[PDB]
Design a protein around this nucleic acid. Sequence first.
RNA 1: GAUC
Length: 405
Amino acid sequence: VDWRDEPEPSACEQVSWFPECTTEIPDTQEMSDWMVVGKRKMIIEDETEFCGEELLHSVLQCKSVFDVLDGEEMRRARTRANPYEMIRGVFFLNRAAMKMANMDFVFDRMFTNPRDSYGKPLVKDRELLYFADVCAGPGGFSEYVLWRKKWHAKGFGMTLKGPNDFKLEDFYSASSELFEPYYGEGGIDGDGDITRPENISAFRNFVLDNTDRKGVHFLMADGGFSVEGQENLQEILSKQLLLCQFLMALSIVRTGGHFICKTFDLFTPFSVGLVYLLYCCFERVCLFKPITSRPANSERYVVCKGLKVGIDDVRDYLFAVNIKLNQLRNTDSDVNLVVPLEVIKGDHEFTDYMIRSNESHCSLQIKALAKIHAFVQDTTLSEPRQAEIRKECLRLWGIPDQARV
RNA sequence: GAUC
Ligand SMILES: *P(=O)(O)OP(=O)(O)OP(=O)(O)OC[C@H]1O[C@@H](N2CN(C)c3c2nc(N)[nH]c3=O)[C@H](O)[C@@H]1O
Ligand SMILES: C[S@@+](CC[C@H](N)C(=O)[O-])C[C@H]1O[C@@H](n2cnc3c(N)ncnc32)[C@H](O)[C@@H]1O
């Protein structure tokens, strides 16, 4: 693979969206036969329903190169190969916060100043902005929003307890009156597992009780966990986390509200079916990878604007699917479809975009993967432009180049 | 995925 034939690094990013959905929202009746249960599948290599066989195989052999390469020795080449590496978290708690700084700019203040379809803001600067942040420890996403909105925003967060819990005291700004954590059933005493029906309903009730029963203006979800030793099966291993995050959106996001969620590879029809559901439920959806997302990984984001009225059937349906997933844990079964492949493919415009997205992200990732590998086999190579690139990105995004401590 |  020739990685040196990649486009020049740049602060400028382009975005294209899915076509706006014209078909009606699926109801309970229509979806009554949509859930397919079959053998649990831990193989990814043949998932070519929305991606060319060459591209899928190339990005997997490119990942698997590092199966025998030293992990630290690999991340040191990664640090050198990635032109956007030096940005890091600037004065925030992690680099994840700068992803929201990155994307809030690109999507025209969609999150810090949410509008409706007509161009009218949802919140009067001279009212209060409500947001939710799920699967979110230590809290970088909320750190950005709170730092940007001060006391004009109130955030509700749920994440897994443990070493990766929220770190309020480390927020550059914020306080307990700006950001209020809730861990599911039991409240502050829950575990924050978003994949539990109890926690789901509980956090939903909580968010509604504090948003005039309207829900939040937007939701951000950035869920992930270690897939060490079996990295290639990352999409499958986190299939449920993805579903629960899409579901949480349909559960607490107000009408006309927004939603941004981290996904990984989207080769399986299970994942693609989920996006299709978001596409039916929101006024406009796109798949985007910001430059603050490392170019060799399968990380991208799905950005959703304007929640449609009457999405409750889809909400109930997905809550129901999640329950089956909990029931099929440690068994040889699994939910492999949430929307029939014929229905997804029935929409040519959706499918055309979805395929084109998968492929353009594969080719970029392959090069970056090949790039890291080259930076392993040669430690003198480097991007001499990291400093100047970082500088323009902060200028562009309106992030002051000041320091944390 | 975050961190080291
Ligand atoms: P993130 O964990 O999804 O990815 P990250 O930004 O942290 O980059 P990194 O893990 O270091 O590597 C990028 C992609 O390659 C896969 N890896 C990592 N890794 C150590 C490893 C991978 N793949 C195989 N086949 N074998 C390996 O030992 C990551 O999951 C990313 O997709
Ligand atoms: C790396 S973080 C994202 C970073 C975060 N957005 C930030 O800016 O700090 C991913 C989080 O998802 C959480 N997570 C994974 N599985 C979860 C689950 N089933 N329920 C709740 N949180 C989960 C992890 O604990 C982890 O904290």
